[PDB]
Design a protein around this nucleic acid. Structure first.
Ligand SMILES: [Mg+2]
Ligand SMILES: [Mg+2]
Ligand SMILES: [Mg+2]
Ligand SMILES: [Mg+2]
Ligand SMILES: [Mg+2]
Ligand SMILES: [Mg+2]
Ligand SMILES: [Mg+2]
Ligand SMILES: [Mg+2]
Ligand SMILES: [Mg+2]
Ligand SMILES: [Mg+2]
Ligand SMILES: [Mg+2]
Ligand SMILES: [Mg+2]
Ligand SMILES: [Mg+2]
Ligand SMILES: [Mg+2]
Ligand SMILES: [Mg+2]
Ligand SMILES: [Mg+2]
Ligand SMILES: [Mg+2]
Ligand SMILES: [Mg+2]
Ligand SMILES: [Mg+2]
Ligand SMILES: [Mg+2]
Ligand SMILES: [Mg+2]
Ligand SMILES: [Mg+2]
Ligand SMILES: [Mg+2]
Ligand SMILES: [Mg+2]
Ligand SMILES: [Mg+2]
Ligand SMILES: [Mg+2]
Ligand SMILES: [Mg+2]
Ligand SMILES: [Mg+2]
Ligand SMILES: [Mg+2]
Ligand SMILES: [Mg+2]
Ligand SMILES: [Mg+2]
Ligand SMILES: [Mg+2]
Ligand SMILES: [Mg+2]
Ligand SMILES: [Mg+2]
Ligand SMILES: [Mg+2]
Ligand SMILES: [Mg+2]
Ligand SMILES: [Mg+2]
Ligand SMILES: [Mg+2]
Ligand SMILES: [Mg+2]
Ligand SMILES: [Mg+2]
Ligand SMILES: [Mg+2]
Ligand SMILES: [Mg+2]
Ligand SMILES: [Mg+2]
Ligand SMILES: [Mg+2]
Ligand SMILES: [Mg+2]
Ligand SMILES: [Mg+2]
Ligand SMILES: [Mg+2]
Ligand SMILES: [Mg+2]
Ligand SMILES: [Mg+2]
Ligand SMILES: [Mg+2]
Ligand SMILES: [Mg+2]
Ligand SMILES: [Mg+2]
Ligand SMILES: [Mg+2]
Ligand SMILES: [Mg+2]
Ligand SMILES: [Mg+2]
Ligand SMILES: [Mg+2]
Ligand SMILES: [Mg+2]
Ligand SMILES: [Mg+2]
Ligand SMILES: [Mg+2]
Ligand SMILES: [Mg+2]
Ligand SMILES: [Mg+2]
Ligand SMILES: [Zn+2]
Lengths: 91, 248
RNA sequence: CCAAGCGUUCAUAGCGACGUCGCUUUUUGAUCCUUCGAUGUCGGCUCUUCCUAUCAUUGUGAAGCAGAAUUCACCAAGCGUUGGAUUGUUCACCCACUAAUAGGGAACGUGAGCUGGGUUUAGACCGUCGUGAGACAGGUUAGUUUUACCCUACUGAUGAU
RNA sequence: UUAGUGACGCGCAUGAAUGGAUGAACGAGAUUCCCACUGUCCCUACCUACUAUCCAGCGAAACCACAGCCAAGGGAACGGGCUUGGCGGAAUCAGCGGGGAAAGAAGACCCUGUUGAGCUUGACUCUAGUCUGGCACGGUGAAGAGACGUUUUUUCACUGACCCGGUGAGGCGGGGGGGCGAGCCGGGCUCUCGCUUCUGGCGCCAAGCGCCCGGCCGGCCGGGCGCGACCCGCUCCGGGG
RNA sequence: AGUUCUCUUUUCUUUGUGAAGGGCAGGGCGCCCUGGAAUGGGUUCGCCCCGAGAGAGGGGCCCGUGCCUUGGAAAGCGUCGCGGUUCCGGCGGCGUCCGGUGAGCUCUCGCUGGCCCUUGAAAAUCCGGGGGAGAGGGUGUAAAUCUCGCGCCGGGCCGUACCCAUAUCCGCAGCAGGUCUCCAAGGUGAACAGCCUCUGGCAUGUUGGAACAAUGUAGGUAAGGGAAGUCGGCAAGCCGGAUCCGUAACUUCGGGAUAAGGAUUGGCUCUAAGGGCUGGCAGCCGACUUAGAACUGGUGCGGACCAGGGGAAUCCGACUGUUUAAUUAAAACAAAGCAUCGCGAAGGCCCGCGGCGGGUGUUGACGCGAUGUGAUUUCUGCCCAGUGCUCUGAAUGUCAAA
RNA sequence: AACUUUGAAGGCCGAAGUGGAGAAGGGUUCCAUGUGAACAGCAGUUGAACAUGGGUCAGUCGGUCCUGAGAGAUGGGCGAGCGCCGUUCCGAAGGGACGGGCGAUGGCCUCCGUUGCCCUCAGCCGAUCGAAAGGGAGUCGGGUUCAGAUCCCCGAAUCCG
RNA sequence: GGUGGAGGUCCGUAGCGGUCCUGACGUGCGAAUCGGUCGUCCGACCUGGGUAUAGGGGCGAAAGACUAAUCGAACCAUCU
């Protein structure tokens, strides 16, 4: 059955810290504990070892990722930007 | 009066950094012939957590060009690098995430991290998690480049300064509420003795300029001049303004 | 005390102006005589005693005392003078009963009798004041109550000439 | 019902991070009411244990001018003593808390002292630090502006004092030599490059070539030098100055 | 060995095997080989695993502290019985046996998971691998060589008793204080709770006897009333476990909540259900639970012990946390959150008599340094005259030395 | 002889003990015998008191070694100076090695050692100190004393050199 | 409807602490102790030893607290 109506994972904190902070941290708690698909092997095993460090239990490949998400929007934008400049550097 | 807490921090003692479990100093390679003329290859062996630092650290291994040895380097981990990846450092390295190049050869708009303040110093700027610097322009005649630092300041640096392409990993760390004095206790138990912080108004006049009074009030303007003696320079030090920053 | 008035009449049943003579030390003052090598500082509780300037009761006198009720005055302190809500309260106000619900003293009786609510240390908050440290017969909250086996007095207990 | 709660508000003297208003959960935080409960009380009684109590043994201390019954008087304005009265009878036991203005501690309150200390500041007099000008370390060359070949100043440069960073001070500067392109009528130059980018391997302690020398009987054994790995230089390499 | 008036094939005690070596159970493996899987399968309490090779077969390795064996029955122990100098490691008989069970407790090994803006030492020391400079003998009495099995010699120095705490330590003392650990039985019970008991320990806490006055200190009980007491329900008291039912306002939807409020609870005799091993059935094993019913007692049953009183509100602080050791535990402090301020390293902030000195800094603005406010929600109005702070300056009054 | 010892009763601590062992600290308090002067807040035939004598045995259990936070020399700097700062930072910081070459000596003189010099090769980059709970090879069973034993004896092992 | 087992989560022991009785005691057992009643009890938790900070100095989740029974400036000797 559905046990909570809205708190979800942040139900571990009971009534403490205020609704808005619990609401805000709920997005991170889900993301930082999710298992992401590993781009190197495909098994849904990529898990966070520490803040910024993401490890896959299948192929053992460790990746420097985001604090709470596997890759950040800023980092993904920079990779495309660095790709384009490289092409326009060597044509 | 007595010496105030801010004064006592500079004497070391119970205010020194907690470096027991740190993994070493995170630096670029020491610039040598290979990086001055071409490039050198290296392989990322591990990405490790460093206590007291938000960003992860990469453990890259190079071949010694003069001896039969392996050199282990402790880099700042640019976001997106993985173990087993090849990274290349030098003048002729290719513009890929994780490569170390002189900023002179980088085109305008390049995003870099762990950027040398001066040529050869092995990386000083934009090393905090998530941060980076951009390249604005080059002046080949004077051999100098213009970069934008994470604080927003623009600096003119030597073109020969090396730097890592990409942004430091572990970004967005400050987007999570701590939610707990205990969680903030653990954050600083790995850094230094700076927590918790006791307000000046909550002390006696003996140990703070703001202390004392039958009401908890500062009692004097909190903007203190830049030249105030140690033990008096508390509050808003040399503030150009105060209040809410409204607008740009 | 005098007596202009009041009391329908009528100064003096009962009151009493303008004036004036006293008493008391349960009010506050004034003073600074004793105590600063310390006389424990409010109130309550408990307990005894004393005063009378008498509320009640006994015996009386006078009324604008028909009766009832009441008022004034005498001898008079023997016996009483209570239960409660609010307040730290003294003081006050009301509820209820009562014959009546009088007023006081005893180092403003009584902290080696208690309590500690208030005042009156150190913590802390608010307001006003001060640049500030800080202050406020301004509010608020938390804040250690020591000793008797000596002498006397007293209560009882042996006893003594 | 001087309490509490809800309203009112010309509020002595409320009020917006000297934060205003709120509000779930939480509190050995302050307050009011109610149900229940009860010896808190009316109004006290009884019971148990350990004391107190008496005995054997053993055994201090605080405190003490002399002491120790009252009334009034006067008196340093509240006497245990003195005056006038009341009166007075050995030695003691258990209690008691009226008095000894009982003990305890040279009053913390208050005032005085030409006695302090903690703290503050718009007190007086200073002071570390700090900002700023001058002189010295302290040099070289160009110009610009001046003054009378010297000399003042501004700007731009220099490096060698001085400073900073890196390195196990490991290839710096200049030239030579070689490869890809350009181009004038096969050679010279404009001028660039110095052999590593697919893979989570390996990579040193010389191959080869040229020239000399030695030991043993042209053949076996054993060495040296050079190139390979360009040449010459004055600061290790950079950044400041 | 105890009990035996009656009963009890009863109750109590006791009923071994070290290190090291070998062998074997058992446990683990992210190790290999065959093979190729959807009608997807395997699988745990949960998970989790697979075309990057699942199921199914057959292997390999690691730990084996478990059992057997050498040790080793010769020793030890229980019991019975003999000697002696009788202060003998004295001598003999018999025995040291067979099974069951468990969310049990203690330890340990292993597997797998969660938490971190926390990622949880270093070095001595030991070992393997890559490489192949070298060395070894010329067919032998073979050589270099050997981390294999035996055999030979040695291991110096200092500590070591006992107390380890209501009497061996610190508080002036045999001081109701303080002072770091290890092992840890039966019953009841959720239980390392309380209450009783075995092993082991002790003698009531630096004295005894006789009384049973007052006043105490510590426990109880009280008719009728039920806070009238008091500054104040201080103190005491009521509630209390578990099962079943039931549960409001408000809420940040997590709570509030054991809300509040009821019923039940003993003893005894039964019934039903819940499993394992072997060969939709048969046989044999077994361990505690749950529910239901009858009967039963003077309505007494969580019978001792253990064990929340509750509700409606107001103020303050969000919370958990901290604090004046020895009169204040709080509304004070901290806090997450929020908002300012300085700083790009010849730097900010700070230390230092001193320097090519030092902390932040193994740091680099998502950082370090300095302040205010104090979760969330909602909002944070006007004032730059004052006092501060800050920015611009030869345009430019005053202005030291040189 | 209330208090010592033995025997028997009745009780308590009730495996988070009033049980059995340690660390720190104590330092002989441990054990046997004797005394009952003083001390053990009564007593004592008793004591942790006094007196006279004994008692602690190791390659294997600890220290010893390692490094930890840290402390601390030299070089250097500072300092009137005792000195201080500093710990890799302004340092010619290695006294070592397989192998090879020259001699000098020796002995199981055969041929192998040793030694001196030369050649060659050489990062560790920080003297030293820092834990009786961290790291750190290797000892277990039985017996034995008044008091010691994983230490003595018996038996069976093991590590290191 | 199950499974699962989070938490600066709740009752509660050890431990740590110390609210009220304004209890005991107050020439004490004690120059701060004792009883009941109480707070917390997976964490900002409790604790041993090692180590660092030294007196106008340290250290302070801030009480002018603590710094050897001494703290709004320790203790020791000297000036004296
Ligand atoms: Mg304060
Ligand atoms: Mg000040
Ligand atoms: Mg008339
Ligand atoms: Mg006079
Ligand atoms: Mg006096
Ligand atoms: Mg008196
Ligand atoms: Mg007195
Ligand atoms: Mg009269
Ligand atoms: Mg009085
Ligand atoms: Mg009195
Ligand atoms: Mg008193
Ligand atoms: Mg009071
Ligand atoms: Mg006060
Ligand atoms: Mg003001
Ligand atoms: Mg009332
Ligand atoms: Mg205000
Ligand atoms: Mg006696
Ligand atoms: Mg007298
Ligand atoms: Mg008296
Ligand atoms: Mg005086
Ligand atoms: Mg005085
Ligand atoms: Mg004078
Ligand atoms: Mg002064
Ligand atoms: Mg002073
Ligand atoms: Mg002045
Ligand atoms: Mg398979
Ligand atoms: Mg036998
Ligand atoms: Mg090999
Ligand atoms: Mg011993
Ligand atoms: Mg007793
Ligand atoms: Mg006794
Ligand atoms: Mg004792
Ligand atoms: Mg009653
Ligand atoms: Mg009754
Ligand atoms: Mg009342
Ligand atoms: Mg009353
Ligand atoms: Mg109560
Ligand atoms: Mg409620
Ligand atoms: Mg609070
Ligand atoms: Mg603290
Ligand atoms: Mg206190
Ligand atoms: Mg207290
Ligand atoms: Mg502010
Ligand atoms: Mg505003
Ligand atoms: Mg202004
Ligand atoms: Mg013991
Ligand atoms: Mg013992
Ligand atoms: Mg005696
Ligand atoms: Mg003895
Ligand atoms: Mg030194
Ligand atoms: Mg050592
Ligand atoms: Mg050790
Ligand atoms: Mg050890
Ligand atoms: Mg031996
Ligand atoms: Mg909790
Ligand atoms: Mg709790
Ligand atoms: Mg008391
Ligand atoms: Mg007493
Ligand atoms: Mg802490
Ligand atoms: Mg200092
Ligand atoms: Mg204060
Ligand atoms: Zn993967």
């Amino acid at each position: 059955a559905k046990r909570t109506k809205k708190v979800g994972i942040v139900g571990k904190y009971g009534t403490r810290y205020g609704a808005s902070l619990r609401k805000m941290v709920k997005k991170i708690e889900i993301s930082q504990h999710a298992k992401y698909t590993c781009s190197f092997c495909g098994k849904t095993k990529m898990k966070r070892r520490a803040v910024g460090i993401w490890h896959c239990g299948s192929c053992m490949k460790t990746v420097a990722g985001g604090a709470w998400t596997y890759n950040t929007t800023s980092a993904v934008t920079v990779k495309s930007a660095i790709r384009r400049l490289k092409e326009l550097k060597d044509q | 009066g007595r010496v105030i807490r801010g004064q006592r921090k500079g004497a070391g003692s119970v205010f020194r950094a907690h470096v027991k479990h740190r993994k070493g100093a995170a630096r670029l390679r020491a610039v040598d012939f290979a990086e001055r003329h071409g490039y050198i290859k290296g392989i990322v062996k591990d990405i490790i957590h460093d206590p007291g630092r938000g960003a992860p650290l990469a453990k890259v291994v190079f071949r010694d060009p003069y001896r039969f040895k392996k050199r282990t380097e402790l880099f700042i981990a640019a976001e997106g690098i993985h173990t087993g990846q090849f990274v290349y450092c030098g003048k002729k390295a290719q513009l890929n995430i994780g490569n170390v190049l002189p900023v002179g050869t980088m085109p305008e708009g390049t995003i870099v991290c762990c950027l040398e303040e001066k040529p050869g110093d092995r990386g000083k700027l934009a090393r905090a998690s998530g941060n980076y610097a951009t390249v604005i322009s080059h002046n080949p005649e004077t051999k100098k480049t213009r970069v934008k630092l994470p604080s927003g300041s623009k600096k003119v640096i030597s073109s020969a300064n090396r730097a890592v392409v990409g942004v430091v990993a572990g970004g967005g760390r400050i987007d999570k509420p701590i939610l707990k004095a205990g969680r903030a206790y653990h954050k600083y138990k790995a850094k230094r003795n700076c927590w918790p912080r006791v307000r000046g108004v909550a002390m006696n006049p003996v140990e703070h300029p703001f202390g004392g009074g039958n009401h908890q009030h500062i009692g004097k303007p909190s903007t203190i001049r830049r030249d105030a003696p140690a033990g008096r320079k508390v509050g808003l030090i040399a503030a150009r303004r105060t209040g809410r920053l409204r607008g740009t």
